[PDB]
Design a protein around this nucleic acid. Structure first.
Length: 132
DNA sequence: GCTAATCTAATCAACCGCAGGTTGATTAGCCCATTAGC
């Protein structure tokens, strides 16, 4: 079981396209401001930006056009989330039982450890690809 | 089918120390990443 997917509104899509036409690689500041402006969480904005970059690269692949890429100085990234030893131990205990936790498991871990669900999913994806 | 959510692999970068391991954050995926709600 995974997360229930998101459904877009016309104004949300217009804002997403208007923000992507200016900068296809937005920092955490622009992503959070746009998410605050459209009524969806910032992880959803980041996921949509990644998927839009993937589709634009695929489209430049279809049309055999070169992709511009990084233009201008890169914006600031998200500040690294500090995870304590207790939260790390709890995440390791949950990782031994299930390597691929569902949406309910991630929500429960977020309500417990206090870390965002997106950060817990990032930690799980980094832990699966580093501890066989 | 369309596209968000998810996975893995590779890589950049903060952290702590005063060098380079460790782990979180970012990006790309090339019989055009895969899988599953809408």
């Amino acid at each position: 079981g995974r997360r229930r997917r998101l459904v877009w509104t016309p104004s949300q899509s217009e804002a997403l396209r208007a923000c992507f036409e200016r900068n296809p690689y937005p920092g955490i500041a622009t992503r959070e401001r746009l998410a605050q402006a459209i009524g969806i969480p910032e992880p959803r904005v980041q996921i949509w930006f990644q998927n839009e970059r993937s589709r634009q690269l695929r489209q430049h692949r279809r049309e055999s056009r070169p992709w511009p890429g990084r233009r201008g100085p890169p914006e600031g990234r998200r500040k690294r989330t500090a995870v304590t030893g207790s939260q790390t131990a709890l995440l390791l205990r949950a990782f031994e039982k299930d390597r691929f936790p569902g949406i309910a498991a991630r929500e429960e871990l977020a309500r417990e450890t206090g870390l965002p669900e997106s950060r817990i999913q990032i930690w799980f994806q980094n832990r699966r690809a580093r501890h066989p």
